[PDB]
Amino acid sequence: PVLRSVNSREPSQVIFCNRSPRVVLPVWLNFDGEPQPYPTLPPGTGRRIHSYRGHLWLFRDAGTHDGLLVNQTELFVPSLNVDGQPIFANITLPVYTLKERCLQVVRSLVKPENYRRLDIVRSLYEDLEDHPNVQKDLERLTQERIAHQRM
Amino acid sequence: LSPNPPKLTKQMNAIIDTVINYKDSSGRQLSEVFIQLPSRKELPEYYELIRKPVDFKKIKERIRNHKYRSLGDLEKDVMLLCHNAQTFNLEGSQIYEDSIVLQSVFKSARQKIAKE
Amino acid sequence: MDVFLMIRRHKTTIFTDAKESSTVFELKRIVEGILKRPPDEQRLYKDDQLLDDGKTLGECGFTSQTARPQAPATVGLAFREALCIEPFSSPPELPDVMK
Amino acid sequence: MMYVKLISSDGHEFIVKREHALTSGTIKAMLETNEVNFREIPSHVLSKVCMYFTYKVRYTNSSTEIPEFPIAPEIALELLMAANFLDC
């Protein structure tokens, strides 16, 4: 699997900084590429945590699983701690598309049994039903990594 | 409670240090994950399945407190750690295979100490 | 500091940005570029109060905290005519499944 | 020039920067010159879409903290239809 944590021996102190209004779910990809949920971060909170150089991290909304940014990108990889100093991982909201932002609002106000009762275009029902998840984005981020590695 | 003969304590430490400082053919320190048990608030399912939990820190603590009165008492606690590891973790997983090698290293370290 | 504005004149809305340090006269120049009316033919308003050309937007009450990209501050505009802000269309009644 | 006019179904005109209107692929295709008419998008929805363009241009590929784009429950469905149509 392209997206996985390498069997790193180098320990890395990270500052997980939640600069977002969402409860953050930190996601560690293990050595097989499998997503592992870590303790959640309330909005405006920071945790000093122990990780490893070359380990893979993803950040999601803990209640909805919406994708989040970390240092302006989707994947977080701890680097070298210059003179013990920790690595700063700034977790923010991405600039969601207006369509995605809208889907998040409708999902938060309507229970799934009532999606089909909304006066919207037939296709938008399937868009509401297609909830964000780590695994869907893992496939897309795999292709982007391969394309980068090839160039 | 009271200290065991110093030869016995020295023998216990030599075996445990060999097991803890051990590097497998791949060059990895296998003891690393078995040093400290997972936190009860981190993995509660461990303390639910494992009735008698033990780690290398608890074993080293029992040597210095003179809780083990023989190399057998020490062996029983190392066999228990490896058994607990082989019970909680799935067969074929790296941690499971690591406990097999450590259990074998103990038997080799014990036999080398008995030969001296 | 950047301010985000919504200039309103009857059924016309201009979405633009400026500095807190920029003048009313300067904002009028942006309006001049778009609507092709000189600054002398323009009248700018904040909460229905007329604004002097020489004043900065910050002095008028437009601050970065209240003039956001996603919630722009309203600027009243009238030409050489009463200041008229025509209401927009209304959303339908909220569905029972969204209540 | 630097500005385009978006006209709502009910007659309201929205003058935005070209850069901001370019967020929408549908608007690129649609672009009197520099004027686009929407016979389906009402003025309360179109205003919100223009606020979304401003918000998107300002916060995209920016280092600073990103605030939540607010959406009141009453416009949510219509704004969903328009965003899907505009592809933004």
UniProtKB/Swiss-Prot annotation, chain A:
Changing residue 5 to L: In VHLD; type I. Changing residue 68 to F: In VHLD; type II. Changing residue 126 to K: In VHLD; type I. Residues 40-95 are annotated as: Involved in binding to CCT complex. Changing residue 110 to G: In VHLD; type I. Changing residue 71 to K: In VHLD; type I. Changing residue 102 to Y: In VHLD; type I. Changing residue 76 to C: In PCC and VHLD; type II. Changing residue 107 to W: In PCC and VHLD; type II; common mutation. Changing residue 70 to L: In ECYT2 and VHLD; type I. One of its GO terms (molecular function) is transcription elongation factor activity. Changing residue 102 to F: In VHLD; type I; No effect on interaction with HIF1A nor on HIF1A degradation. Changing residue 128 to V: In ECYT2, PCC and VHLD; type IIA; uncertain significance. Changing residue 18 to S: In VHLD; type I. Changing residue 28 to S: In VHLD; type I. GO terms for cellular component: cilium; cytosol; endoplasmic reticulum; intracellular membraneless organelle; microtubule cytoskeleton; mitochondrion; nucleoplasm; nucleus. Changing residue 97 to I: In VHLD; type II. Pathway: Protein modification; protein ubiquitination. The Elongin BC complex binding domain is also known as BC-box with the consensus [APST]-L-x(3)-C-x(3)-[AILV]. Involved in the ubiquitination and subsequent proteasomal degradation via the von Hippel-Lindau ubiquitination complex. Seems to act as a target recruitment subunit in the E3 ubiquitin ligase complex and recruits hydroxylated hypoxia-inducible factor (HIF) under normoxic conditions. Involved in transcriptional repression through interaction with HIF1A, HIF1AN and histone deacetylases. Ubiquitinates, in an oxygen-responsive manner, ADRB2. Acts as a negative regulator of mTORC1 by promoting ubiquitination and degradation of RPTOR. It comes from Homo sapiens. The gene is VHL.
Curated annotation (Swiss-Prot), chain B:
Zn(2+) binds at residues 66, 83. It is found in: Nucleus. Residues 3-113 form the Bromo domain. Transmembrane segments: none annotated. The modification Phosphoserine is found at residue 2. During apoptosis, cleaved by cathepsin CTSG to produce a 160 kDa cleavage product which localizes to the cytosol. Ubiquitinated. It comes from the Eukaryota. Belongs to the SNF2/RAD54 helicase family. It is linked to Nicolaides-Baraitser syndrome: A rare disorder characterized by severe intellectual disability with absent or limited speech, seizures, short stature, sparse hair, typical facial characteristics, brachydactyly, prominent finger joints and broad distal phalanges. Some of the features are progressive with time. Component of the multiprotein chromatin-remodeling complexes SWI/SNF: SWI/SNF-A (BAF), SWI/SNF-B (PBAF) and related complexes. The canonical complex contains a catalytic subunit (either SMARCA4/BRG1/BAF190A or SMARCA2/BRM/BAF190B, mutually exclusive) and at least SMARCE1, ACTL6A/BAF53, SMARCC1/BAF155, SMARCC2/BAF170, and SMARCB1/SNF5/BAF47. Other subunits specific to each of the complexes may also be present permitting several possible combinations developmentally and tissue specific. This is SWI/SNF-related matrix-associated actin-dependent regulator of chromatin subfamily A member 2. It comes from Homo sapiens (Human). The chain holds residues 1376 to 1509 of 1590 of the full protein.
Curated annotation (Swiss-Prot), chain C:
Pathway: Protein modification; protein ubiquitination. InterPro entries: ELOB, Ubiquitin-like_dom, Ubiquitin-like_domsf. CDD domains: Ubl_ElonginB. The keyword Transmembrane does not apply. The modification N-acetylmethionine is found at residue 1. The keyword Phosphoprotein applies. Residues 1-66 form the Ubiquitin-like domain. It comes from Homo sapiens. It is found in: Nucleus. Its main location: nucleus. This is Elongin-B. GO terms for cellular component: Cul2-RING ubiquitin ligase complex; Cul5-RING ubiquitin ligase complex; cytosol; elongin complex; nucleoplasm; VCB complex. Heterotrimer of an A (ELOA, ELOA2 or ELOA3P), ELOB and ELOC subunit. The elongin BC complex interacts with EPOP; leading to recruit the elongin BC complex to Polycomb group (PcG) target genes, thereby restricting excessive activity of the PRC2/EED-EZH2 complex. SIII, also known as elongin, is a general transcription elongation factor that increases the RNA polymerase II transcription elongation past template-encoded arresting sites. Subunit A is transcriptionally active and its transcription activity is strongly enhanced by binding to the dimeric complex of the SIII regulatory subunits B and C (elongin BC complex). SMART domains: UBQ. One of its GO terms (molecular function) is ubiquitin protein ligase binding. Belongs to the Elongin B family.
UniProtKB/Swiss-Prot annotation, chain D:
Pathway: Protein modification; protein ubiquitination. Its main location: nucleus. GO terms for cellular component: Cul2-RING ubiquitin ligase complex; Cul5-RING ubiquitin ligase complex; cytosol; elongin complex; nucleoplasm. Overexpressed in prostate cancer cell line PC-3 and breast cancer cell line SK-BR-3. GO terms for molecular function: protein-macromolecule adaptor activity; transcription corepressor binding. SIII, also known as elongin, is a general transcription elongation factor that increases the RNA polymerase II transcription elongation past template-encoded arresting sites. Subunit A is transcriptionally active and its transcription activity is strongly enhanced by binding to the dimeric complex of the SIII regulatory subunits B and C (elongin BC complex). This is Elongin-C. It comes from Homo sapiens (Human). The gene is ELOC.
